[PDB]
């Protein structure tokens, strides 16, 4: 059954089984239209599709654009087939996905890189339109060909940018995978150290940091703990701003600015969808 997929110019090994129909799942390899995400049985069928397919980017509204990097907001009710295909594609790299078919309650934020043939998929995150638990990300994926290049952190940052604009505090949906956890820890460390590096006051509450960053209070405390920056001396809880962490962060900040792997909030053109 499905061990690889042909996706644009890439050949990708799958990590997990995804519930594609038996007709397709029986085959060793699937051929995907990189723009509309239709899955097909062969290279020749794919070629015939590519000759006819009108799509050169995701559906929905392009809400972020900085040069060749875009994010498209796709409504699972308005573009059901696309979003189902995206969820089946995603499950090939997720140990567990809570959802495939019933995509209507979700928004999908699809990040692309443009070149002269169109806007190519980098990754995405899904988000419930109405989350009872205030989750700002349901699932998140960077396509394998793009992994470990900074795009995952861009996606995470973007999810918190939406939350800030919504005047909400956000958290990723539990449970978090190994790679999910590492990524979020890295982002939270970056955000917290930036806040403390820019902050000049003598004391700070977790709530204030949460208000600025849109990061959940629990995730901030968890990060302070992870960096061993929560201390106890003379009956009081202190935030210990470590020298090595601040200095190491500025060196990383230099390399972050050296490349262009950052989301620029001035390149967001968004109001929360359909009033809601």
């Amino acid at each position: 059954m499905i061990k690889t997929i042909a996706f644009g110019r890439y050949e990708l090994d799958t990590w997990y089984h995804s519930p594609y129909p038996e007709e397709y799942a029986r085959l060793g390899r699937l051929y995907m239209c990189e723009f509309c995400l239709k899955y097909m049985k062969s290279q020749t069928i794919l070629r015939r599709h590519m000759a006819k397919c009108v799509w050169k980017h995701p559906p929905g509204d392009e809400i972020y654009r900085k040069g060749s990097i875009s994010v498209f907001e796709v409504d699972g009710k308005k573009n059901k087939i696309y979003c189902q295909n995206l969820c089946l594609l995603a499950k090939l790299f997720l140990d567990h996905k809570t959802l495939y078919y019933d995509v209507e309650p979700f928004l999908f934020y699809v990040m692309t890189e443009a070149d002269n043939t169109g806007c190519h998929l980098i990754g995405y995150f899904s988000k419930e339109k109405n989350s009872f638990l205030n989750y700002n990300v349901s699932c998140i994926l960077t396509m394998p060909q793009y992994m470990r290049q900074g795009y995952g952190k861009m996606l995470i940052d973007f999810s918190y940018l939406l939350s800030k604009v919504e005047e909400k505090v956000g958290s990723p949906e539990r449970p978090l995978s190994d790679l999910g956890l590492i990524s979020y820890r890295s982002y939270w460390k970056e955000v917290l150290l930036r806040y403390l590096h820019n902050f000049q006051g003598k004391e700070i509450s977790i709530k204030e940091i949460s208000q600025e960053t849109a990061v959940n209070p629990v995730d901030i405390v968890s990060t302070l703990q992870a960096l061993q920056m929560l201390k106890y001396w003379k009956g009081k809880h202190l935030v210990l701003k470590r020298q090595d962490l601040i200095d190491e962060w500025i060196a990383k900040e230099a390399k972050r600015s050296n490349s262009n792997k950052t989301m620029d909030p001035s390149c967001l053109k968004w109001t929360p969808p359909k009033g809601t």
């Binding site: 003598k202 004391e203 700070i204 703990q225 929560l230 201390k231």
Partner: peptide
């Protein structure tokens, strides 16, 4: 809103609304 964790083998409970003092190195 309170969170519990252990620092140096001691269990603590911390408020998310109270101002927390920020320190650089400073002996302690």
């Amino acid at each position: 809103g309170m969170v519990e964790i252990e620092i140096e083998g001691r269990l603590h409970r911390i408020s998310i609304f109270d101002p927390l003092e920020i320190i650089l190195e400073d002996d302690l």
